[PDB]
Each structure stands twice: as C-alpha cells, then as structure tokens.
Amino acid sequence: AHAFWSTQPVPQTEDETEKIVFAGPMDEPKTVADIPEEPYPIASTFEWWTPNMEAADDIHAIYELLRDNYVEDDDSMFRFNYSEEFLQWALCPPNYIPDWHVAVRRKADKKLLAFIAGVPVTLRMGTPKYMKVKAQEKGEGEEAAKYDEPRHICEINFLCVHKQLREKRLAPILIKEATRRVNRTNVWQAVYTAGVLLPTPYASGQYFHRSLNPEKLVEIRFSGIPAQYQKFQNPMAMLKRNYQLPSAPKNSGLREMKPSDVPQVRRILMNYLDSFDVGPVFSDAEISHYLLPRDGVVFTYVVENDKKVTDFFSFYRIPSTVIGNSNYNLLNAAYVHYYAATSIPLHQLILDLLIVAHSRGFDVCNMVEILDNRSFVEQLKFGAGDGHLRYYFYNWAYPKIKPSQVALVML
Ligand SMILES: CCCCCCCCCCCCCC(=O)SCCNC(=O)CCNC(=O)[C@H](O)C(C)(C)COP(=O)(O)OP(=O)(O)OC[C@H]1O[C@@H](n2cnc3c(N)ncnc32)[C@H](O)[C@@H]1OP(=O)(O)O
Numbered sequence: 001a002h003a004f005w006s007t008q009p010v011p012q013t014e015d016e017t018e019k020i021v022f023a024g025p026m027d028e029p030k031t032v033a034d035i036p037e038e039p040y041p042i043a044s045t046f047e048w049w050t051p052n053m054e055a056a057d058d059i060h061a062i063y064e065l066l067r068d069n070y071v072e073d074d075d076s077m078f079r080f081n082y083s084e085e086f087l088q089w090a091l092c093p094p095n096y097i098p099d100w101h102v103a104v105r106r107k108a109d110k111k112l113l114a115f116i117a118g119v120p121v122t123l124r125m126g127t128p129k130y131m132k133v134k135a136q137e138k139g140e141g142e143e144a145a146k147y148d149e150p151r152h153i154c155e156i157n158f159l160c161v162h163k164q165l166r167e168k169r170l171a172p173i174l175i176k177e178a179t180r181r182v183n184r185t186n187v188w189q190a191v192y193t194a195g196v197l198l199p200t201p202y203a204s205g206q207y208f209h210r211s212l213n214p215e216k217l218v219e220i221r222f223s224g225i226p227a228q229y230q231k232f233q234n235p236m237a238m239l240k241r242n243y244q245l246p247s248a249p250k251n252s253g254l255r256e257m258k259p260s261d262v263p264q265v266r267r268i269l270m271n272y273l274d275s276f277d278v279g280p281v282f283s284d285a286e287i288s289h290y291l292l293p294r295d296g297v298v299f300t301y302v303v304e305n306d307k308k309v310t311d312f313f314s315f316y317r318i319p320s321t322v323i324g325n326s327n328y329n330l331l332n333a334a335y336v337h338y339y340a341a342t343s344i345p346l347h348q349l350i351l352d353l354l355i356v357a358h359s360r361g362f363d364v365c366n367m368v369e370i371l372d373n374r375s376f377v378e379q380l381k382f383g384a385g386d387g388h389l390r391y392y393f394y395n396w397a398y399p400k401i402k403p404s405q406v407a408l409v410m411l
Pocket residue numbers: 001002003004005006069070071072154156157158159160161162165166167168169170171172175178179182183187188189190192193194195196198394395
C-alpha cells in the first residue's frame with residue numbers, strides 16, 4: 001500500500017496504465033481560487049523557505065544538502081555531487097518561478113533539512129501516434145487530439161531529505177507544498193523521473209555507460225574486468241586498448257556552439273524532437289540557456305559546413321563522490337544531453353562526443369535509452385548498467401510507451 005501515493009491523482013497500478021488510451025487530466029478541474037493561499041502546516045521547529053537561486057550562499061546550502069544526502073547507488077559506493085554552477089544552471093532557466101523552489105529549514109539554526117525543485121517546461125504530451133491511429137479506426141479522432149498542443153507544466157527534480165530525517169514522512173509534505181505553489185500559478189500537471197518504482201511510470205529505460213578511463217573505473221569498482229580478459233597476460237593494457245579513442249574529433253567542421261548558432265540549433269533540434277511522442281519545446285532563450293557552453297557544466301558542439309549548422313551534440317557533467325576508495329575522490333561523468341544529426345550517421349556524430357569527453361578528462365559517458373540512443377550502443381561500445389530511469393506524470397493519464405518514444409532529458 002502507498003499511504004501517500006494512493007491519495008494522489010496518478011495511475012495506481014500497472015494494469016490501470018495499460019488500459020489508458022487518451023492523454024488527459026485525472027483530477028477534478030480546479031481553479032487558483034480553490035487552492036489554499038497559506039503554506040501547508042509543518043511542525044513548529046521547522047519552517048518553509050524559498051531559496052534565492054542567485055545568492056551564492058543559498059546555492060551553497062542546497063549544494064551541501066545534495067552532496068551529503070542525494071541519490072546513491074544500491075551498494076552505496078557512489079553519491080551524486082552536482083556542482084553549485086550546475087545547480088544555478090538547472091534551477092534557474094528562463095521564466096523560472098522562484099516560488100517553485102521549496103525548502104524546509106530547522107527554525108532554530110536554519111540547517112536545511114529537505115529540498116524539492118520545480119522548473120517550467122513546455123511539453124508535448126498529447127496522445128501518442130500509435131493510439132491516435134487506433135482512434136481514427138474507432139471514430140474518436142477529436143477525443144484523441146484534445147490535448148495535442150504543447151502545455152506549460154512543471155518539471156520536478158532534486159527531491160532530497162537529510163539522512164537524519166528519513167522515514168519521518170517529510171517527503172509527502174514537501175510534495176504537497178510544491179503542488180500547492182505550482183497549482184497557485186495555474187499549473188496542474190508535472191513531469192518527473194526516478195530510479196525507483198512508484199505508481200505509475202508511462203515509460204522506463206535502462207542506463208548505458210561508455211568507459212573512457214577504464215583503469216580508474218575498475219579501481220573504483222564502477223566496472224569489472226571481463227572474465228574473458230582473465231585468460232590474458234596483462235588484462236589492463238587490453239581493456240585500455242579496447243576503449244581507446246582518437247585525441248581529436250573526426251568531423252571536419254566541428255567546433256563549439258556560439259550564441260549566433262542559437263536559431264539553427266533550435267530549428268534542427270525541434271525538427272528532430274517533433275518526431276517523438278513526449279518531448280520539450282524550446283524558445284531561443286531556452287536553447288541559449290540549456291545548450292550554450294558553460295565551463296564545468298555543459299559542453300556543446302555543432303557541425304558547420306558551408307556556413308550552415310547541419311548537426312550538433314551536447315553533454316553535461318555530474319561528478320559522483322566515490323564513497324569507499326582512498327586513491328580517488330570523484331568519478332567525473334559526462335551525460336549525453338540533446339543532439340541532432342542531418343548530414344552524418346548518429347554513430348559518427350556521437351563518437352566525436354566520446355572523443356571530446358575523453359580529451360577533457362571525463363571517466364565515463366552515461367545515457368538512458370531515450371531518443372535514438374540505442375542506435376549507437378553496440379558500435380560505440382556502450383554497455384547496459386544496473387539503473388533504470390522511470391518517467392512519470394502527475395495528474396495526467398497517459399498510455400504506456402517505449403523509452404525510444406521519449407525526447408525529454410532530465411538533469
Ligand atoms: C502539479 C504539480 C505537482 C508537483 C508534484 C509532482 C510529484 C513530485 C514527486 C516527486 C518526484 C521526485 C523526483 C526525484 O527527484 S527522484 C530522486 C529522489 N531523491 C533521492 O532519492 C535522494 C535520496 N533519498 C532521499 O532523500 C529520501 O529517501 C527521499 C526524499 C527520496 C524520500 O524520503 P524518505 O525516505 O524520508 O521517506 P518519507 O517517509 O519522507 O516518505 C515516504 C513516501 O515517499 C515516497 N517516495 C520515496 N521515494 C520517492 C521518490 N523518489 N519520489 C516520490 N516519492 C518517493 C514513498 O513511496 C512514500 O510514500 P507512500 O509509498 O507511503 O505513498
């Protein structure tokens with residue numbers, strides 16, 4: 001049983017999600033005036049806080065909570081170490097609503113105890129193509145297309161409760177208060193991901209990893225040495241050779257994205273993202289924010305030929321604290337962000353990603369099997385990992401889709 005999730009406008013079982021045919025809301029329609037204006041009650045030793053995302057010391061405070069208390073692997077060997085710069089970037093996109101950043105502090109000393117963050121996203125989330133087809137056969141086209149237009153909704157990330165405060169039901173309260181603040185801005189849907197199984201995902205995808213620095217990955221035990229590499233003399237030289245990469249990209253006309261590329265990148269990205277059932281819609285400003293390079297945070301390259309941007313790729317950095325080793329403090333991981341190819345095969349574009357990530361000192365490259373990420377797995381030597389990223393809507397009935405019909409990257 002789910003004492004909290006059973007009370008919420010989400011599908012409640014796998015069975016329920018498989019019978020859904022049309023996209024649409026679940027809840028009673030409400031209005032801003034229906035929503036309580038006062039924050040949800042919490043115990044008297046705690047207070048609600050709205051962090052200022054431009055205050056270095058507020059960012060710092062959130063940074064520390066997440067450094068010590070955020071997502072770990074199942075064997076507690078790694079914990080995410082999102083940087084302060086990464087957090088300002090993720091939390092403060094264009095037109096972000098400060099009130100959507102929800103923190104609980106200890107009233108006495110103002111120690112931060114819990115955090116949840118919401119940012120705006122414009123998302124296509126209408127009935128998926130296959131169901132739309134089936135609806136025409138059945139005569140229900142107008143029903144299937146009712147919510148086809150991109151919607152301005154909330155993207156929830158960064159939910160974290162301090163380890164000292166776990167299992168005290170503080171997360172339900174955080175989610176209720178975030179929901180209140182979002183509803184009071186006339187927004188009624190949300191999208192979120194989790195590694196855990198909650199009621200109920202509309203999509204699920206496995207994680208994939210590409211060793212860039214296998215000696216380190218083996219030392220820290222992210223990776224194992226293959227059983228077949230044992231029947232060799234010095235297996236470490238063999239593993240290194242297996243994963244080796246050119247020192248420089250193979251596409252002539254690859255360079256870093258610059259501000260003037262914004263319109264062309266937006267155009268080729270939107271064309272590509274348009275073919276997926278679930279995907280974001282970006283303005284020029286959002287393309288600038290989410291894709292222009294920032295030191296230590298986001299790395300973006302375009303292929304330009306004849307003065308035309310024909311392809312691009314992006315990746316971003318999230319180091320993980322290595323909990324148990326001594327020789328190493330950090331895993332430096334690059335994550336496949338957005339991309340688009342028109343002039344070359346995807347596998348050839350993404351090799352350049354690997355090449356750049358490797359020469360800049362990253363240890364591994366990570367991705368979930370959304371977009372067309374599967375198309376390059378075998379040739380670029382990515383392996384499936386333990387992780388499964390699940391995708392969820394709050395207050396939105398949506399049929400079950402393959403992860404290759406998802407075009408939304410979560411930070
Ligand atoms: C329209 C606007 C709507 C906006 C809201 C949209 C929904 C937002 C949803 C949030 C999207 C988050 C997206 C991400 O960031 S997912 C990443 C979540 N973060 C972490 O895992 C960091 C490390 N862990 C922790 O900090 C805590 O253990 C957390 C905070 C995760 C749980 O704290 P704690 O261990 O102290 O437990 P509790 O006693 O307070 O509460 C127990 C209840 O919480 C349910 N639970 C456990 N894990 C999750 C989870 N990842 N999403 C949603 N619910 C979760 C659980 O089923 C139970 O409910 P029920 O089973 O009794 O019913």
